[PDB]
């Protein structure tokens, strides 16, 4: 039936995806022609963050549209017997939950990690409204398992012989779009790629590992990447496992498109393709940015963010304004003609933004006291306003001031030199601290 | 040259020893017959306690002398990027030193684990001041290499091929005794076994399969300890791998007791076989008591204690009274006839008791946070007055009271029956933990 109908929302996040992988953010090595597309019919994002540098806080900070800071998830969710932390369903009204509120069904396609108990699971995507929730981990995903029969995904009972977890992911996007079609979706495709240990199908694989050599020479994939290297990870950049992983990505989001436009789809639709947090150290590509996922550095934070919706959002535009993961819920909200309900937003809308509108200078922060991982020289919390970034370091406590515009590597410290701006910035961050009653690092006495 | 001399003493500690491993402790299934021999030559303790329920804390306990809440080292000391923490040899007169002021030399053999930081190592045993150290740990032990070469021990640089790190330990012992027999020492017998993943000779390792075999059935060894149990553990009671390790210590121990008769010295030594914390779940025997390794329960810090000196103490003696880690510190300054120099002790010489006298009832304390396992549900302080033992837990948080002389296992909480007996024994752990400045557990907000 035609009629206008509030537009369908496929959020496409990558986990672990670096700011350098793709080919539109300078990749020559790995191959995204599909993401290039969607760049090209769409909004590149070159100063897009995840609100944290690793996964669930970054998670909790889309599903919430809080600070993790606020929420108390500043770390990674552990096994069960480590944390007593999860998302709790009646502290929070969830996007999903507000969508259904605006006329949406619902679907999560694969990570949740905002909780880890798996005894009851009271804070598990079913638990927080989901209408569909399709090959979630059913224990701790931990190093993963991306052949069927999947050891971390109980739900996908049923699978094709030695099936790829990115590729079963993918056909469940197209089938989810299928079975909707005749009314609004929110569909969270939350992909297990581009997780350690990395893993791909092997035609993929022996296609980088030739790439590799071409580019560095005869047996250097052997040399760098053979059967000794167990994990697949070095300190080499171009990682011919990374890049087949990618592309495994890239063929669905591909896959992803050509549904939607043979369902007619198209055009009230928007897509929007994220990473949760940096590139891993030894796996992934963060370009000239400072280190990685873990960190508070620009490597740990910046992310690749395409946002696509054909007839509202100009093609291959490119948007240097920051924006964060906390502003997909407001703006989610605004696409669907929704309110929020009491709830508090620590993001912005950016459908003016998206719709070719100017963009108001605003702080952005972070805080990772490291209570999982206990990487005591990463415990810091950092403020972004305008070009200026101020880092807090707890171990060995100092400040670090940056100008990005000018060093984008984070290479040359500044809070010597221009000490009142780091005091202007060190007042934003100190009462910020206190409005989220930031949790302190885990050091000594 | 004849002539008295303050005695020498040598202290044996085994790593993640269970209290129901040896013979003399009921074992039937490992043999330990010179451990067993040890025994009947000396004081055996059934309720000696480490300080801790981990490695680190209860080492701290032994060269400081003081609780490890109040020394703040309450958890093991994880990989250098994952702590502050270390033992600073500038803040604490320890053990060694002690002794070297009353006329010892000293040596270390083995584990240390009060410093991770390999870069300047400044709290390795070196920098306490230790005079010999011996194949001491030059890299994060983790899950440990017994044979030789010794990935984590650099300082070995010469071994025989495929030579085993208990055998190579109680030999460096041997060596040390002889090199050093014509004055007063001090020798810290610090053994990595039996700490996990467990590795023995192979000889040793079928012969325990074989009694295994004889005593649960044909092919039951290769059934739970085959090629596809990859670490050697299960819920199985007698475990061949661990009885295989226990057999390389007690032949080693017997190396030691027979070059002290062939060197003269054992009249004038004194030899303290004890263990680190409790077994280690999957791998060790705590009998009936309580949990293991990672608890406050009884099996998680009730460890094997014999304790040896031909002539001053009586052979084949049994001492129910409590005793701890934090009571070796005064005992071998009394033996060397030293004194304490401003430096706190939170134990008490035991050489009046160990020489037949009376013993006071006095409470004794734990404090376990898990700051670095993060083990939530395990996260507690105790309390043990005469037979009462009081645990506060904060996961869940409760108070459990146990009678251990009618209740050993921990099986029945008294808490809500003996209300009076339980809130006095609140008043002293409350009282220690402002005392010692106990840290909080690491949970939620
Ligand atoms: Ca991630
Ligand atoms: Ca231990
Ligand atoms: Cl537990
Ligand atoms: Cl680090
Ligand atoms: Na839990
Ligand atoms: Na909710
Ligand atoms: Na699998
Ligand atoms: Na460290
Ligand atoms: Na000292
Ligand atoms: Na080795």
Redesign the interface.
Same mark, same amino acid.
């Given at each position: 039936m035609q009629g206008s109908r509030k537009p369908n929302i496929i959020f496409i996040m990558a986990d672990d995806l670096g700011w350098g992988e793709l080919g539109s953010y300078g990749n020559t090595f790995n191959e995204t022609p599909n993401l290039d597309r969607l760049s090209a019919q769409g909004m590149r994002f070159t100063q897009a963050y995840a609100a944290a540098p690793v996964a669930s806080p970054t998670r909790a900070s889309i599903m919430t549209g809080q600070y993790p800071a606020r929420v +108390?998830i500043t770390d990674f969710l552990?096994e069960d017997? %480590?944390?007593?932390?999860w998302l709790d369903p009646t502290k929070y009204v969830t996007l999903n939950e507000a969508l259904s509120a605006s006329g949406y069904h619902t679907g999560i396609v694969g990570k949740w990690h905002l909780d880890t108990d798996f005894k009851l699971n009271k804070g598990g995507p079913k638990a927080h409204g989901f209408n569909e929730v399709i090959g979630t981990e059913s224990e701790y995903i931990a190093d993963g398992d991306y052949f069927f029969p999947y050891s971390k995904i109980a739900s996908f009972d049923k699978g094709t012989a030695n099936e790829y977890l990115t590729d079963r992911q993918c056909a469940e996007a197209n089938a989810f779009i299928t079975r909707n079609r005749e009314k609004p979706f929110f569909l969270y495709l939350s992909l297990y790629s581009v997780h350690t240990r990395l893993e791909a199908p092997v035609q993929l694989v022996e296609k980088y590992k030739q790439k590799f050599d071409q580019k560095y020479g005869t047996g250097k994939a052997e040399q760098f990447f053979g059967a000794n290297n167990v994990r697949h990870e070095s300190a080499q950049r171009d990682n011919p496992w990374l890049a087949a992983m990618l592309e495994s990505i890239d063929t669905g989001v591909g896959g992803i498109m050509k549904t939607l436009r043979e369902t007619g789809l198209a055009e009230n639709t928007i897509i929007v393709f994220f990473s949760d947090n940096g590139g891993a150290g030894k796996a992934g590509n963060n370009a000239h940015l400072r280190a990685g996922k873990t960190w508070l550095y620009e490597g740990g934070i910046r992310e690749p963010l395409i946002v696509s919706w054909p007839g509202k959002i100009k093609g291959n535009t490119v948007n240097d304004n920051p924006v964060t993961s906390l502003d997909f819920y407001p703006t989610f909200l605004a696409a669907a003609g929704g309110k929020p309900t009491g709830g508090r937003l620590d993001g912005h809308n950016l459908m003016p933004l998206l719709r070719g509108g100017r963009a108001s200078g605003r702080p952005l922060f972070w805080h990772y006291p490291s209570?999982? +991982? %206990?990487?005591? !020289?990463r415990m810091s919390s950092a403020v972004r306003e305008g070009n200026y970034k101020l880092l807090e370091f707890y !171990?060995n406590p100092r400040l670090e001031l940056y100008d990005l515009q000018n060093d984008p590597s984070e290479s040359h410290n500044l809070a010597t030199d221009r000490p009142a701006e780091t005091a202007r910035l060190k007042k934003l961050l100190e009462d910020w601290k206190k409005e989220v !009653?930031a949790?302190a690092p885990?050091?000594?006495?």
């Open positions: +108390g552990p017997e %480590k944390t007593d932390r209570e999982t +991982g %206990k990487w005591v !020289n !171990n !009653n949790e885990h050091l000594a006495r």
